[PDB]
Design a protein around this ligand. Structure first.
Ligand SMILES: [Mg+2]
Ligand SMILES: [Zn+2]
Ligand SMILES: [Zn+2]
Ligand SMILES: [Zn+2]
Lengths: 77, 224, 81, 42, 816, 111, 191, 45
RNA sequence: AUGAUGUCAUACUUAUCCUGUCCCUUUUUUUUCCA
């Protein structure tokens, strides 16, 4: 259970993990944020979207980082 | 915490009575606890022992084994305090015999001054309003009055050694404890020193339940 | 129990009892990369000690090639304090 | 002392070998000697 | 009353003290927003007595200083009227032998004076610099250092000018001077933006009448030098002269600290100053070379180390000037008798050696190898060893080297303690004499041999050691008669029965055979090793360690001056070294099984290993299973895999588990060349993953782990898929070892098979009714997520969007 | 290309004294650079600025004159907007142009 | 009681099966799950792999395999071929007959190189005749008794066995084609 | 008087292994002389 | 048809241990009808 002190330290360590009660909302929103961080990181899906819509890389990443805030609806209750 | 002070720091009836009483409160709280537990005489004689203990048993090198033996004779189940109780009991039983302690490897000085401190304690006992009672062989009352006095002076088992109840600082048992190999789960002591390693003296095995009996305001259950 | 307060540039070392094994994987083979520890488990009387034994720092704690394939060596000072 | 398992291993050994070959029966038993074997049986 | 209520609701410090980390979040957030309204008026009086309560613990302190710092950030203004109170109640903590009391008082005072109302500080703590008590002056002075950390010196420097130019009190001039030295201790490099402003502050008191202020200002010079490394007297020249004159026109405590400061500036100095200043101070030094005093000795010798260790103290200078009185009065028994003097006298004397060579220092401390207090000659070899080990022995001339070698022999005989002191001394000294040692090898050995003859074990053992040291140079001077001697004579002593000597003899023989190879050894190993085999039965850790070392060397490299039958007997003896109580022995044993498999073929040694697997008691079964792995690694695994697999059919437990554990180690050891035997081994692991026992499945899982990490990247993913099918059911398990080896198998299998496959195995049980299954799947998915969280972005399912949320990812299905 | 491991943004100090590495959430470090005696560059252990629940739209070094170097990041705080079941805190949240600062003397990064 | 009101949210198995788009999945305890719409969409995704059987059970994993008797492991062909097994059988019988005294006598005077088996026999097994075993593709977890379950869902008529042919009166082998079984006779007779 | 041409004396591990094996034969003998149809020796011994 | 309960010995696991341990200085507190 000191293992648990370390393990909810691990929950505090890695944003996106889970535990047996985790809610569909936390799960899917964390995966959605991660999806955004990687669309930004990988230099080429950025071209994919930039080219799919008719936007430009500054436009693209600005949208993405705005969306990063409430990507999957408002919260659960 | 012991109950000599109100929540603002002045004197309770319990609190005054102990200051007039000769010796310190922890002991004093235990003596008052004899009032509740009807172990008057036994708690009295225990007090008389802890007054002077530090020199009870002579432990010469040139007679180590016979000495350890005239000691190991009295070793009672429950702890060092009731050990002392029976030891004094048997000495006075012998009629305050000096050769008794000489045969049984006990410092006559310690014994007889302790007897004197108990007798003058009894001479205080009327003022501190104590009824002269026996536990009738019920050492449970004895250990419980010991708790009602020395709840603060407690440790618990940890798998990394014996460690305090409160501060969880790490102690060890004195080698010469009547429980030194017994190594109980719920421990009471009387000394707190750190010789070559942290130590505690005149120790006894307790119930953590008596702790919620006595000090639910100081000792809460979740911490046991 | 682990320190895990994050990594640094200070190498770790092994007593001679502990000589040879990896820090976690407990291997004896094919060590690839050197170990690094934190300043806090770097200072003072803890300079040059055995991450495992606590003995004197003489031989260099290393990282079993499996541990580097799975990058369990990118967490920092794993000192069992 | 003596435990159900050993007592039955004894029983079996004796009933096979006979009641005067105490040294081999002792050899079957781990930490038991022929004095104790003979006493236990008799 | 609202004030008592606000405190009532304020004691959710219980919410933060006890409770969940959920509790911590609720209360921490609510108060971090309620901080202004709830105010520090009531807080501080509730707050100080807990922070001072005797046993508030590490993290209680951590959390409460979290509180004080963030609530003081919050309430830059709403903490105002409690400043002197916080100040004086926490003050002793920065000057306190608890580094973390220093740290935490430091940090919270940083934030306190930081968001504080500023003038307040000055206002409160002006009149205390003039105070009468050096106690309070030191406390407030090191406070002022902390307050300069909190704010910055500039805002303060003129008020420092005041507290240091005061003509009312010397108390206050001393106070300002120690404020100076204190910041000079604390901020360190951060002073060069001023670098002389403080020097100005201090120019007033090195001439002062109170020795207290004078000499603490000397130490201020010291501290400023320290934080003010080699950048020299472009700031400090403004005070160099009072130091200079007081050094001589003074006596005592001033001599101490003023010498300390001047020696701290002696690095920063330059020739036309660091020639005149040093040359002048040297005559002070010569009168102080007889100083009885301890911290005197420390300061003067440290001084000398830097001072007569510059480029402007001539070789000639020191050799004619410092050395005679230095050697005279410090090379008395007293200093080696001392606990401090031993090592520090070492320090500076090794440095003077570094300065001026060996052909005089060595000569000045030769015959201290024959003094009385064995501690003394112990010290002199401690030094000499350090010295020649760092420097080399180039200039040591003839007669010098003679008296040295001879004092060496003496020290080593005279030895009366079990110490590596004289050993290492000897090793180093001949290590540096190199080839200079030719003509005394009769002498050196004859000594060692007569010792080898002694009655008491200890000296015998010592002489064996010393042989093991000088073993290499023994040869390198071409000791035909003499190294031949040591060879055959040790072959003689191989009959000892004092384990403590027998072990050292084996060590010395090993350290001879290292230099002289096998095929010119003086006892041919053809007779050595036959003699060694009956020793392997000596049931003692030290002799066993050294014997198995020697036999391992021989079986590695010699190996052909012996017969197959000899190697077989030695195999049978190794089989019961696997029960020694020391692990070095057991690892050496396994290595030599490897070497013997190389020399002789593998098949007979493998047959003798399986029969050992039949034993019980686990730690020699496990070490034979290591040995099997090792034999297979050296002589290619196809030679041994059929025999292992076939032995997997003997119906006994310990042996089926021995086979499985051995394959575990084998796949670990070979690694990327498992892409061959993965197919051969699968149907045996699937066999043992369909139950046979707990340990059966624990071990087959370990094997899967190591196979996966070996076959990473070679395409054998169908086989690891097949074995996933069999490992994954054990996921619900309880025994720690079993479930743990299972989890390990799944991390290995995660890199080797990819994280899609394993996210699919982990999909359906994330949101299961139960809680045992929910918890195991979230444990796995956590470990799958931590490592390789970034692949998964292309592996997540498609999870439809209900009414008031959006859940599909349209980003990913733009067409293009 | 993770989310909380640094590397997406990286800035320097205009003079060439320190670098900061930064992620798009929860992590940024700083490295100090000194010529060695032979002027062959060295790099000591890194600093820390772990602050939870915070985006970063950029990080950049501010040009100070031989003071402590310091950096201007943007920021945001998705925290509340995920505590509010109404979507109010989605709106009404403000970028916070902020500066962290070195302290090369005391060797830490202060907000 | 709040768990009990969510328990009134704890819908019917018919509630589920009618709601859901893929009704094959819906099982018993599905409903006591905090998010059954998810749980069922997941369990109806492609390629995903369902929880083992045995989380319900009170018996642990293969304590049900406890009872039976089991035959020892059967080597791969290409390893039998190289004739190791007979070497090992022979050595076994030798050393089970030999007595303790002779055992130690052979410890002190070994029968060095009693046997031999040549390389290129091994190296050709492992490098020239090694072959793909039978593997099971993604998803098919092994559960207790699975190897006992015979096999099903071959509704095909042409599926015949050789023991089937023998104990039905028809031919085995290349004549399993040109042999119409005794059931094709009444297929021709009445359909 | 011993004899020449002999090994040593069995070490306690081998003595233990064969004590075990002899015990097992003792068991097989008794279950033979008592004719038990309710017995099995499993593939793990 | 496998429950927990156990003071059950045996079997078994971690290349898990054989090297992480020990005895107090000094000394002090007022008292109550006798029968
Ligand atoms: Mg004869
Ligand atoms: Zn490791
Ligand atoms: Zn650390
Ligand atoms: Zn170690």
């Amino acid at each position: 259970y000191t293992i648990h002190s370390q393990l909810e330290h691990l929950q505090s360590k890695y944003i996106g993990t889970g535990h047996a009660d985790t809610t569909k909302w936390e799960w899917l929103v964390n995966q959605h944020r991660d999806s955004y961080c990687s669309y930004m990181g990988h230099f080429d899906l950025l071209n994919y979207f930039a080219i799919a819509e008719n936007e430009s890389k500054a436009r693209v990443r600005f949208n993405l980082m705005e969306k990063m805030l409430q990507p999957c609806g408002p919260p659960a209750d | 915490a012991l109950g000599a002070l109100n929540h603002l720091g002045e004197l309770t009836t319990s609190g005054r009575k102990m200051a007039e009483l000769p010796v310190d409160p922890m002991l004093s709280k235990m003596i008052l606890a004899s009032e509740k537990y009807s172990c008057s005489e036994e708690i009295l004689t225990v007090a008389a022992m802890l007054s002077v203990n530090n020199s009870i048993f002579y432990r010469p090198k040139d007679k180590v084994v016979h000495a350890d033996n005239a000691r190991v004779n009295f070793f009672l189940p429950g702890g060092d305090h009731l050990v002392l109780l029976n030891v004094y009991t048997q000495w006075a039983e012998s009629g305050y015999s000096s050769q008794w302690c000489y045969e049984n490897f006990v410092q006559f000085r310690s014994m007889r001054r302790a007897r004197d401190v108990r007798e003058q304690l009894e001479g205080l006992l009327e003022r501190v309003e104590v009824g002269l009672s026996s536990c009738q062989g019920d050492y449970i009352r004895v250990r419980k009055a010991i708790t009602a006095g020395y709840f603060y002076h407690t440790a618990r088992l940890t798998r990394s050694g014996y460690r305090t109840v409160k501060q969880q600082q790490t102690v060890f048992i004195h080698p010469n404890s009547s429980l030194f190999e017994q190594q109980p789960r719920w421990l009471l002591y009387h000394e707190l020193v750190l010789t070559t390693k942290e130590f505690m003296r005149q120790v006894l095995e307790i119930e953590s339940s008596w702790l919620l009996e006595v000090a639910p305001h100081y000792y809460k259950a979740k911490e046991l | 129990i682990f320190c895990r307060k994050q990594a640094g540039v200070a190498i770790g070392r092994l007593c001679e009892k502990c000589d040879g094994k990896c820090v976690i994987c407990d291997s004896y083979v094919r060590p690839c990369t050197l170990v690094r520890i934190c300043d806090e488990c770097n200072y003072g009387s803890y300079q040059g000690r055995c991450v495992i034994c606590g003995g004197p720092g003489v031989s260099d704690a290393y990282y079993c090639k499996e541990c580097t394939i799975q990058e369990k060596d990118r967490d920092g000072c794993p000192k069992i304090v | 002392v003596w435990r159900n398992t050993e007592d039955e291993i004894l029983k079996a050994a004796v009933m096979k070998y006979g009641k005067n070959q105490w040294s081999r029966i002792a050899s079957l038993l781990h930490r038991k000697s022929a004095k104790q074997c003979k006493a236990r049986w008799y | 009353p609202e004030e008592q209520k606000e405190r009532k609701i304020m004691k959710l410090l219980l919410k933060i003290k006890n409770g969940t980390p959920p509790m911590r979040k609720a209360a921490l957030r609510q108060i971090t927003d309620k901080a202004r309204e709830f105010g520090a008026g009531p807080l501080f009086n509730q707050i100080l007595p807990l922070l001072m309560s005797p046993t508030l613990e590490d993290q209680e302190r951590h959390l409460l200083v979290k509180v004080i710092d963030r609530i003081l950030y919050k309430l830059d203004d709403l903490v105002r009227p409690y400043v002197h109170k916080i100040l004086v109640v926490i003050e002793p903590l920065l000057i306190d032998e608890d580094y973390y009391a220093r740290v935490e008082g430091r940090e919270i005072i940083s934030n306190l004076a930081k968001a504080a109302g500023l003038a307040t500080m000055i206002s409160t703590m002006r009149p205390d610099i003039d105070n009468m008590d050096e106690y309070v002056r030191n406390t407030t002075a090191r406070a002022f250092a902390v307050v300069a950390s909190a704010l910055g010196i500039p805002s303060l420097l003129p008020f420092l000018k005041a507290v240091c130019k005061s003509k009312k009190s010397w108390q206050a001039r001393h106070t300002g001077i120690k404020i100076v030295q204190q910041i000079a201790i604390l901020m360190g490099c951060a002073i060069l933006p001023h670098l002389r402003s403080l020097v100005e502050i201090i120019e007033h008191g090195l001439v002062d009448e109170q020795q207290k202020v004078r000499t603490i200002s000397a130490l201020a010079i010291a501290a400023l030098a320290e934080a003010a490394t080699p950048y020299g007297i472009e700031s400090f020249d403004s005070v160099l002269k009072p130091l200079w004159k007081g050094i001589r026109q003074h006596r005592g405590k001033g001599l101490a600290a003023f010498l300390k400061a001047i020696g701290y500036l002696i690095p920063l100095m330059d020739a036309e100053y660091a020639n005149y200043y040093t040359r002048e101070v040297m005559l002070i030094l010569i009168r102080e070379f007889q100083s009885p005093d301890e911290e005197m000795k420390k300061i003067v010798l440290k001084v000398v180390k830097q001072c007569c260790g510059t480029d402007g103290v001539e070789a000639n200078y020191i050799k004619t000037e410092i050395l005679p009185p230095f050697f005279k009065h410090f090379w008395q028994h007293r200093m080696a008798l001392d606990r401090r003097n031993y090592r520090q006298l070492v320090d500076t004397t090794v440095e003077l050696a570094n300065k001026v060579g060996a052909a005089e220092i060595i000569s000045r401390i030769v015959d201290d190898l024959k003094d009385e207090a064995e501690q003394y000659r112990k010290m002199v070899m401690e030094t000499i060893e350090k010295i020649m080990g760092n420097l080399g022995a180039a200039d040591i001339d003839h007669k010098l080297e003679e008296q040295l070698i001879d004092g060496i022999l003496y020290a080593f005989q005279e030895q009366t303690t079990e110490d590596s002191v004289m050993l290492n001394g000897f090793g180093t000294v001949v290590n540096a004499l190199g080839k200079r040692v030719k003509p005394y090898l009769p002498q050196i050995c004859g000594t060692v041999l007569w010792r080898l003859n002694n009655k008491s074990a200890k000296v015998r053992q010592q002489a064996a050691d010393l042989i093991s040291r000088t073993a290499v140079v023994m040869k390198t001077c071409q000791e035909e008669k003499l190294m031949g001697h040591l060879g055959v004579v040790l072959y003689e002593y191989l009959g000892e029965e004092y384990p403590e000597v027998l072990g050292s003899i084996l060590g010395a023989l090993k350290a001879i055979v290292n230099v002289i190879g096998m095929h010119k050894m003086t006892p041919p190993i053809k007779d050595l090793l036959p003699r060694l085999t009956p020793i392997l039965k000596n049931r003692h850790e030290k002799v066993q360690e050294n014997c198995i070392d020697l036999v391992g060397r021989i079986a590695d490299r010699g190996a052909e001056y012996v017969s197959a039958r000899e190697w077989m007997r030695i195999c049978f003896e190794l089989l019961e070294l696997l029960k020694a109580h020391k692990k070095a022995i057991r690892r050496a044993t396994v290595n030599t099984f490897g070497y013997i498999a190389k020399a002789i073929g593998p098949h007979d040694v493998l047959a003798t290993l399986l029969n050992n697997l039949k034993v019980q008691e686990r730690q020699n079964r496990v070490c034979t299973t290591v040995a099997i792995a090792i034999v297979a690694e050296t002589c290619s695994p196809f030679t041994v895999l059929p025999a292992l697999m076939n032995e997997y059919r003997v119906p006994e437990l310990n042996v089926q588990n021995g086979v499985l554990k051995s394959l575990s180690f084998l796949f670990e050891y070979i690694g990327e060349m498992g892409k061959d035997y993965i197919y051969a081994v699968t149907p045996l692991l699937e066999d043992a993953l369909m139950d046979r026992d707990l340990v059966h499945r624990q071990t087959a899982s370990a094997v899967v782990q190591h196979m996966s990490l070996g076959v990473y990247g070679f395409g054998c993913e169908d086989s690891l898929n097949h074995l996933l099918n069999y490992v994954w059911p054990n996921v619900f398990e309880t025994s720690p070892h079993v479930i743990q080896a299972v989890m390990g198998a799944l991390e290995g299998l995660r890199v080797a098979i990819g994280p899609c496959r394993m996210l699919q195995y982990c999909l359906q049980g994330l949101f299961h009714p139960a809680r045992k299954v929910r918890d195991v799947y979230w444990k796995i998915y956590n470990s799958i997520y931590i490592g390789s969280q970034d692949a998964l972005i292309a592996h997540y399912p498609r999870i439809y969007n209900d009414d008031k949320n959006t859940y599909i990812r349209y980003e990913l299905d733009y067409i293009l | 290309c993770r989310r909380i491991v640094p590397g997406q943004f990286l800035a320097v100090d205009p003079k060439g004294r320190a670098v900061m590495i930064s992620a798009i959430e929860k992590q940024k470090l700083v490295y100090i650079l000194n010529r060695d005696a032979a002027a062959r560059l060295t790099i000591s252990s890194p600093l820390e600025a772990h602050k939870a629940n915070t985006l970063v739209y950029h990080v950049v070094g501010v040009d100070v004159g031989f003071e402590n170097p310091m950096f201007a990041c943007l920021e945001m705080d998705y925290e509340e907007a995920d505590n509010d079941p109404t979507g109010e805190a989605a709106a009404n949240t403000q970028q916070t142009l902020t500066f962290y600062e070195l302290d090369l003397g005391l060797n830490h990064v202060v907000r | 009681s709040k768990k009990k009101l969510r328990r009134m949210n704890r819908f019917t198995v018919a509630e589920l099966k009618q709601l859901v788009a893929r009704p094959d999945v819906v099982e018993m305890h599905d409903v006591t799950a905090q998010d059954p719409k998810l749980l069922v969409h997941l369990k109806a995704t492609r390629n995903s792999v369902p929880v083992p059987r045995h989380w319900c059970f009170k018996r642990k994993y293969l304590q049900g395999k406890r009872g039976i008797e089991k035959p020892p492991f059967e080597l791969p062909d290409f390893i039998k071929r190289t004739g190791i097994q007979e070497m090992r059988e022979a050595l076994q019988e030798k050393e089970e007959q030999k007595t303790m005294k002779s055992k130690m006598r052979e410890k002190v005077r070994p029968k060095m190189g009693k046997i031999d088996i040549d390389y290129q026999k091994l190296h050709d097994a492992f490098f020239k005749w090694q072959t793909k075993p039978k593997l099971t593709i993604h998803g098919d977890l092994y559960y207790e008794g699975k190897e006992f379950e015979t096999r099903l869902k071959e509704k095909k008529p042409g599926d015949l066995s050789d023991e089937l042919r023998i104990s039905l009166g028809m031919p085995v082998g290349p004549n399993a084609h040109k042999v119409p079984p005794p059931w094709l006779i009444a297929m021709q007779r009445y359909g | 008087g011993g004899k020449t041409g002999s090994g040593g004396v069995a070490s306690s591990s081998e003595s233990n292994r064969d004590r075990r094996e002899r015990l097992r034969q003792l068991a097989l003998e008794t279950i033979d002389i008592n004719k038990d149809p309710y017995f099995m020796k499993n593939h793990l011994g």
